[PDB]
């Protein structure tokens, strides 16, 4: 039941206000005081806790949307899952204290039993479950969109000259980025015909053994398709790793920087320098 539960929430709201004034001291007092004033936070809390059980014992769509709004507001406000968990813990603490003091349960009886005594905790857990369910949706969505953006941005082959396809990569290449690089480079050289592909290594902070191995294999595969691969702008740490790999390092034709890499590629296409 949700009616008498709301009738007792009419005082559990003041109990939770006491809970808030007890809890605000322990964690981030200046931050909480500065970001929002106490009366506004208190009224938001009582709105969140009072209309949850205003429906007929089943659910409420409007308050579900309000709970999602509260979850996103507390995510933006600086209350992660840990802070909401501390809030739930202090909620339980002050509910227990009020039970000791108020002693006014749901069902009318000269001495009520454990039924409502634990139905209170079950309803608290249900509210917390709904809150955490609404908590992670926006975070997962933004993680997904950021992952898609990094997936698309790692291998820009769009910079293209006449018979030249310069491919700059600047991020820290890991396993996934290395596989993405090789896949996109091969598919692009397939789609767009070319003769020289400049791989701009200048920018990557650290390349481990396997990433360097896959980059050299990318160069060899591009050569095997029929296009010279000029690995341009390699930095001494990457040279450290590449030679320490121990593979043969004569088929790759490197270059100090794209300034002269472009003109050397044009030199390969003898009459394209003009």
């Amino acid at each position: 039941m949700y009616k008498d539960f709301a009738n007792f929430i009419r005082t559990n709201k003041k109990d939770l206000l006491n809970n808030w004034m007890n809890e605000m001291e322990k964690q981030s007092d200046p931050l909480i005081n500065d970001i929002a004033k106490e009366p506004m936070y208190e009224e938001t809390s009582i709105e969140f806790v009072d209309l949850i059980v205003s429906n007929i014992t089943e659910n409420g769509s409007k308050f579900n949307e309000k709970l999602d709004d509260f979850a996103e507001k507390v995510v933006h406000l600086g209350w992660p899952i840990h802070f909401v968990t501390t809030g739930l813990r202090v909620f339980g603490l002050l509910v227990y204290t009020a039970m000791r003091d108020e002693d006014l349960f749901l069902k009318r009886e000269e001495k009520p039993e454990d039924d409502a005594y634990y139905r209170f905790e079950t309803w608290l857990s249900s509210m917390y479950n709904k809150v955490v369910t609404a908590y992670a949706d926006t975070w997962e969505k933004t993680v997904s969109i950021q992952k898609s953006a990094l997936q698309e941005l790692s291998a820009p082959l769009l910079p293209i000259f006449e018979k030249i396809s310069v491919m700059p990569l600047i991020g820290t290449i890991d396993t996934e980025r290395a596989k993405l690089i090789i896949e996109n480079l091969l598919i692009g050289v397939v789609k767009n015909r070319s003769e020289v592909v400049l791989i701009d290594i200048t920018g990557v902070p650290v390349v481990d053994t396997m990433v360097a191995h896959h980059i050299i294999q990318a160069s060899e595969a591009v050569r095997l398709v029929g296009c010279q691969a000029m690995l341009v702008g390699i930095r001494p740490e990457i040279a450290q790793t590449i030679v320490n790999l121990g593979i043969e390092l004569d088929q790759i034709i490197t270059t100090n920087t794209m300034k002269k890499g472009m003109e050397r590629a044009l030199a390969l296409t003898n009459r394209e320098i003009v």
């Binding site: 090789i182 896949e183 091969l186 598919i187 397939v190 015909r193 070319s194 003769e195 294999q217 060899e220 595969a221 050569r223 095997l224 398709v225 029929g226 296009c227």
Partner: protein, 118 residues
Amino acid sequence: MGIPILKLGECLLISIQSELDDHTAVEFQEDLLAKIHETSARGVVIDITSIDFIDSFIAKILGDVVSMSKLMGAKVVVTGIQPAVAITLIELGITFSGVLSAMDLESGLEKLKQELGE
């Protein structure tokens, strides 16, 4: 059946449209060798565009075919080995495999024409 030897311009063009391993490998190698010996062509041009799956078998078969053709004349894999099979070729059949022509058959004909004009 599926090994279309074509002769033109004192060269030879061959094409693959079968995409299977065993009979393609054996019949292809024997037929290409038999023709390149029977008709004296300096440059033989091979096709891989249709192929979209390669294992170690066909990879080593192509390597041996290129080696033998080089043992009788100029050899080129005119069409770029597709990426899904380029990776397989480079992991196991580690070879330069003659000269290449960037998935352009006409480009390979031009390359062999200029290399035989000298």
